[PDB]
């Protein structure tokens, strides 16, 4: 089903508030690029995760904007809820097979967390959504939030545009 025809859910998590601001900006760029009012932003901390990640509609896209935290955070709970859904016998295999698809954008600090930790929770989200049967529309994007602010914005704008291009092919 056509991307312009789809309802678009933008999930995010935030401790410091930057990923919220970035999710508003990604939402506004998608709204203006597709001339659609079918874009919603959802804070993963305020949402019933089984309702969204245990079942999906053919006319729905999921975008996941996720910072990474090496400390324990609500994001740990998001990733565990995905793993529980993959593993629990009481839930069917590939419950998101009917989703139009999904893409992940991760935020991380390369200066401090270069290596296995850089955007590690966005990498895990991308792998687990694919194991839930959701078709990946675009490759995982990562933004180093220690670049200049102009470059952080240019990076998530290029990823939003690549996402819209892939979704139209
Ligand atoms: C305590 C702490 C731990 C962090 N751990 C990681 C990490 O493991 N990997 C990473 O890529 N970035 C890490 N970062 C950088 C954050 O992901 C980044 O600052 C992100 O923009 C936070 O978004 P928020 O403002 O929406 O919470 C960490 C930052 C802090 C303050
Ligand atoms: Mn529930
Ligand atoms: Mn429920």
Author numbering: 81 to 249
Provide the authors' original text about this structure.
The S-adenosyl-L-methionine-dependent tRNA 4-demethylwyosine synthase TYW1 catalyzes biosynthesis of 4-demethylwyosine (imG-14), the precursor for wyosine, the hypermodified guanine-derived nucleotide present at position 37 of phenylalanine tRNAs of archaea and eukarya. Eukaryotic TYW1 enzymes contain N-terminal flavodoxin-like and C-terminal radical-SAM domains.
We determined co-crystal structures of the flavodoxin-like domain of the putative Tyw1 from Schizosaccharomyces japonicus in complex with flavin mononucleotide (FMN), exploiting an unexpected anomalous scatterer present in the recombinant protein. Our results show how eukaryotic TYW1 enzymes bind the coenzyme FMN and will help further elucidation of the structural enzymology of 4-demethylwyosine synthesis.
